[PDB]
Write a protein that binds this DNA or RNA. Structure first.
Ligand SMILES: Nc1nc2c(ncn2[C@@H]2O[C@H](COP(=O)(O)OP(=O)(O)OP(=O)(O)O)[C@@H](O)[C@H]2O)c(=O)[nH]1
Ligand SMILES: Nc1ncnc2c1ncn2[C@@H]1O[C@H](CSCC[C@H](N)C(=O)O)[C@@H](O)[C@H]1O
Ligand SMILES: [Cs+]
Length: 92
RNA sequence: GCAUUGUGCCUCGCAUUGCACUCCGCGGGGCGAUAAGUCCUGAAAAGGGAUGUC
């Protein structure tokens, strides 16, 4: 899948509260650069998954490559590139 | 306080590995509380449920 501004993460611990799951993800991936938003819902379609929207695709790539399979909340993170640009990016 | 309702949150059981920004699994239970909010007020960046009826 082609490099993107947004990394799509899944195999996440569905039992983590939404507000808390976001600030973790943020605090964690801010290592690899600046973050424009994190999209997270705990709906049936969107639980266990998250969208981290980087400012620069370089950041996302280093994030994808470094944090792949990382032990996060007793599960190994599965990180791909998003299949499409996030809305906040296309409006630019 | 009772009716209807928008919008999101938390928990438990079963279920779910799911590509979103067009956003609600089923079922118990608990929620105006800026927590959140996809809903509302305001053109000013912030703020907040609403109509009804004692
Ligand atoms: N019967 C009746 N009781 C009310 C009403 N509003 C508040 N109460 C009383 O208020 C208690 C609940 O508190 P709240 O509803 O939070 O009061 P509030 O938010 O200031 O209510 P409002 O003044 O109507 O905006 C209840 O036990 C009621 O007895 C009302 O409109 N009718
Ligand atoms: N945003 C909010 N903050 C706090 N409590 C809320 C709330 N939205 C709804 N409630 C609670 O839910 C009650 C309405 S019942 C509505 C539940 C929900 N819309 C559903 O369809 O499943 C309110 O009287 C209060 O008990
Ligand atoms: Cs529920």
């Amino acid at each position: 899948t082609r490099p993107n501004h947004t990394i799509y993460i899944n195999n996440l611990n569905e039992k983590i509260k939404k507000d808390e799951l976001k600030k973790s993800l943020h605090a964690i991936f801010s290592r690899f650069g600046q973050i424009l938003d994190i999209l997270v819902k705990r709906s049936l379609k969107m639980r266990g998954q998250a969208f981290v929207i980087f400012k620069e695709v370089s950041s996302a790539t280093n994030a994808l490559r470094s944090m792949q399979g990382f032990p996060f909340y007793d599960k190994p993170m599965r990180i791909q590139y998003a299949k499409t640009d996030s809305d906040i990016i296309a409006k630019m």
